[PDB]
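Input set for joint prediction.
Command: fold jointly, output tokens.
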Amino acid sequence: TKLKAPAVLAYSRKINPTNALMFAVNWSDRDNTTAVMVGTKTVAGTQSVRGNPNDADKGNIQTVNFANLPHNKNTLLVKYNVKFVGDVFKAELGGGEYSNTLQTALENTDFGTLAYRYVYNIAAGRTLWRNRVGAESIETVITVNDQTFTFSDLLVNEFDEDVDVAEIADMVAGVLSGEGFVTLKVEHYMLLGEGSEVFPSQEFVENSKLSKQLFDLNGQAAMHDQKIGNAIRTIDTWYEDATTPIAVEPYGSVVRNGVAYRAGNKTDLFTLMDGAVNGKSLTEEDQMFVTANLIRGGVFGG
Amino acid sequence: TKLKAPAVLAYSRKINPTNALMFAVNWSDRDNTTAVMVGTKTVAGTQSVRGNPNDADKGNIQTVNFANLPHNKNTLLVKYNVKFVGDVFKAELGGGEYSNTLQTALENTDFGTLAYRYVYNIAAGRTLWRNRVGAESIETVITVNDQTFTFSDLLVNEFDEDVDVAEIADMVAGVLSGEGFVTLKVEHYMLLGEGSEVFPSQEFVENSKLSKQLFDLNGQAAMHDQKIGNAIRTIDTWYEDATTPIAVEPYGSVVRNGVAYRAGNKTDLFTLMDGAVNGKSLTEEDQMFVTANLIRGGVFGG
DNA sequence: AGCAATTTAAATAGGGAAGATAAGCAAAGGGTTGACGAAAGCC
DNA sequence: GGCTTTCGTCAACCCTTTGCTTAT
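tokens >
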């Protein structure tokens, strides 16, 4: 009794977004996709840090990788492909009598609600992040298996009920609960303005000669595959005292806020996984969380 | 109590101006816009260092970038779009406790007066800097949400009463004290003269083959987006011995003056924000300073 | 069908912001390489 | 009378993890 985790238990990605490519179009003609480019401005500023107050009367010179829309183009086009591969409960590391019993304990999970909020975040354009502020109207074109879907007025933090998101959901939930793959060809149009600053994912640079280093693909401004995939899995409204959706993590970690919303109150992924393999009746909002971390992937052993 | 600021606390800018362009028009016909082309002249000057009195018997040859009005056009047109986005009190980095008991510490702040001085600095033409001097009349055309506004004779230093910079500020203080965005599409007509010198923002150069590199956008003369945004925030008239408006900075620093007005005498932002969070009754003229800094953004941690 | 002039000077200064993190697993094999000396069939 | 094969005897660790100079 008391079935424990395998020492090496890990799961693969079942949501596989590509790197987003940032293009400039207009709101009328969306086919002449001018590619925005990361430029390098060197910016004079002020030294305002919380510790040093005697360094206040000095400037700081920080060269910054910047990405702006061209002044003749008023719409940012964010183009990426999201790949919803199947075989969620199968582990790429470990799994004997644990992954196979987690399969039989996560069999009756609401995958329709799980894959709905997975493609709602795609449809409502949560993957844009800072590209959403100041946008007049965000238009999202999704081209999955020669079917084009268009979304304009979707409120992001409230997962509302519309027909078209529930129609990409029933072809993704069939894969996530089954076997195969479904790829969505996402195209995000937002009317920011002429010359408005677009916001790619900044890169980690250790030493650097640049204060900002923006992600580039052949010099064109781009977003990380992990930044796009972060907002797609921002479906967790099932944590304790839930107000806003958070990204599914094994500890519900929001490191940008510095607070873990799933750790220390017996509601984290590992405790519910142990209860599921040991025989605890998982709640549906917790069963969805456990099978949503298996779609996120990660190492769940140790 | 003494709830400390988080190590990673940061707000984003809620004033997002595009990098300004520079066009050349006439005062009567304001629609035949040409592009102010940044040229490259080579001066022959004097070596006039404070030291080296043994010099200035030799020459000084430097090549600089110059942008001048065409001699058939007597009016410089400076075009940019200011984006006043909302959700000011929500921090991109950090959040919870310190940010949330500062959002509910800055809630009776006079947001009308803040947005009053914010759009009066886009109406008095303070975003033009050295393009202001020598102008006969600086006429500003601000078009927001399909109603244009014209301003021609506003005093730049005195925030005086005007009924049409207050109607714009009503659309801005309904955004800055809430959620959403608004976009002022600003045009700046100044009757400088025929063939006069316009003054774009100068780019920082490290290699420095040139001695003065003006900012260019595909050859067009241009001002930096952080330079236009620097003069929008020049609203701080509530420090010790206030004479002229400076930009709101966390220390009240003017790097071109070498002094910091708010730093040191217990009125800079960090020792005002900490007092507002901890429970000190903030004055109105310092509450607007703190939320003007939150509109400006920056790191406010550690 | 070669000829293209010389000197002279190339800017002084001020700024290059810090705060966070940098995973935990589990594996890492043995198989030959023995010389001296003493039973024990064997020329 | 050696002599040449094969079996029988006798054991027991503590390890360390790049420069040596460096061109007529």
